[PDB]
């Protein structure tokens, strides 16, 4: 967000007194040959460099930052830029003209948090979930305490699938997405229909089934035993996921050999 | 517009006062195929109104904004040049000189 | 910002072409958008 | 800046045409008037 300001403005002096002096490597005999007008319009630069006025540049180094995180929309950085320039062209001083400098050489460096924001989704995945888990009932359900293993598999899923896995709080009911596409929106305040079977050995509306199928991959010997339903189903969903991988590769193979066809004797 | 610093000037967003002076001198504006001084006889010129049109390129704002921001800098600025620039001055010549 | 480039190159009478004294951005918004709203006749080249 | 125009309408562009609007319209002297090439009144009859 700065070199995009460098690569939007500011067309050096070492590179100029490295060429006039003929200290380059590839073609030293470069500056000598130019017309004796250029060679007298580049020698009086690396002999008495001309000052500059950097405000615009680093101000453009701030706009290109805002509009890349999300404030000032892409189409408004022609009013924001003028407004910022005129503000910093009023109150300017070594005061502000520096306070910028720090802002521009910190905003491009203090981007690690932003990177973190999208590397553990600690923006709407764990802060939301670790909020929703605090809206759950007490952590002592009656039947079993396979509860905690499931509720931890949920956190692991949300933390190890950065894709989007956003956890909205679309009003009273917090709902889990499986991707920004969102074609597996399962309601996470509607598994207070699993605070039923948390411990037993057709009452699951697929919404609950959707959550089970969504996390299952991330369950191993955790939700465990023959803890009824919740146990097996998870195991059966994992088995079905493996079989689905098998059938996926099989169908690609059988359609690369060559119409419903494979879809029948696969499904 | 025939002035080389305004001929093709690319005006950026803003409010710009723009003004000019128009001749009524008959001989300076009209022409002849006989070479008489129209001011001596009639043939005056009156102006009923003067307007102004300018055609804006409907460029996408997502590009117009970047272009405007990038044209405010010191380096990326217009610089114009007429086809024939000089310092035309006439030197009087006496008759039969 | 009264500047001090050596006049003859900050009016680019004998400076650099309009491919080095323009920021790369404006070069690429004026070479990829030539056959609509051309910019070439705006700036100069020194020759 | 009047001349210039009547020069840069040349060069970058053609001259013998006409574009009403910007009253374009070269001023010209039909060649065979300034230089009377007086080759003769073809007539034998």
């Amino acid at each position: 967000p700065a070199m995009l300001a460098a690569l939007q403005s500011q067309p050096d002096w070492a590179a100029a007194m490295d060429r006039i002096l003929a200290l380059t490597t590839r073609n030293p005999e470069a500056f000598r040959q130019q017309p004796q007008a250029n060679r007298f319009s580049a020698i009086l630069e690396a002999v008495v460099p001309s000052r500059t006025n950097p405000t615009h540049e680093k101000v453009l180094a701030i706009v290109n930052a805002l509009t890349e995180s999300k404030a000032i929309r892409k189409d408004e950085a022609g009013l924001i830029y003028n407004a910022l320039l005129e503000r910093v062209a009023r109150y300017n001083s070594t005061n502000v003209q520096a306070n910028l400098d720090r802002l521009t050489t910190d905003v491009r460096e203090a981007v690690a948090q932003r990177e973190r924001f999208m590397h553990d989704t600690n923006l709407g995945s764990q802060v939301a979930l670790n909020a929703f888990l605090s809206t759950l009932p007490a952590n002592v359900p009656r039947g079993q305490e396979d509860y905690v293993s499931f509720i931890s598999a949920l956190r692991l899923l949300v933390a190890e699938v950065p894709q989007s896995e956003v956890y909205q709080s679309g009003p009273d009911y917090f709902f889990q997405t499986s991707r920004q596409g969102l074609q597996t929106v399962n309601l996470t305040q509607a598994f207070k229909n699993l605070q039923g079977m948390w411990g037993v050995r057709s009452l699951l509306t697929p919404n609950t089934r959707l959550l089970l199928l969504l996390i299952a991959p991330f369950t191993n010997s955790s939700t465990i035993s023959r803890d009824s339903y919740l146990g097996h189903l998870i195991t059966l969903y994992r088995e079905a996921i493996g079989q689905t991988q098998v059938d996926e590769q099989t169908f690609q193979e059988i359609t690369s050999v060559s119409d419903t066809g494979s879809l029948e004797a696969t499904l | 517009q025939k002035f080389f610093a305004i001929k093709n000037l690319l005006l950026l967003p803003g409010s710009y006062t723009y003004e000019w002076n128009f001749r009524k001198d008959v001989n300076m504006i009209l022409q002849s195929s006989l070479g008489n001084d129209l001011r001596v006889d009639g043939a005056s010129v009156r102006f009923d109104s003067i307007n102004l049109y300018a055609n804006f390129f409907p460029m996408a704002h997502n590009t117009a904004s970047t272009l405007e921001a990038m044209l405010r800098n010191d380096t990326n600025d217009q610089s114009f040049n007429d086809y024939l620039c000089a310092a035309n001055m006439l030197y009087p010549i006496p008759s039969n000189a | 910002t009264p500047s001090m480039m050596p006049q003859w190159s900050y009016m680019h009478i004998a400076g650099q072409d309009a491919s080095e004294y323009l920021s790369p951005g404006l070069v690429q918004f004026a070479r990829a958008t030539d056959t609509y709203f051309s910019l070439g006749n705006k700036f100069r080249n020194p020759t | 800046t009047e001349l210039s125009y009547q020069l840069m309408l040349d060069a970058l562009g053609d001259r013998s045409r006409y574009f009403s609007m910007w009253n374009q319209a070269v001023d010209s002297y039909d060649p065979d008037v300034r230089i009377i090439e007086n080759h003769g009144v073809e007539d034998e009859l």
């Binding site: - | 040049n81 | 020759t47 | 020069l7 060069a11």
Partner: peptide, 26 residues
């Protein structure tokens, strides 16, 4: 009628500054 004729590995008008005839300037 035959032409051939030589001199064609391109042209120079080298840079660091650009071409001749003027573009625009009596």
């Amino acid at each position: 009628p035959r032409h051939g004729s030589r001199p064609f590995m391109g042209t120079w008008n080298e840079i660091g500054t650009s071409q001749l005839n003027g573009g625009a300037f009596s």
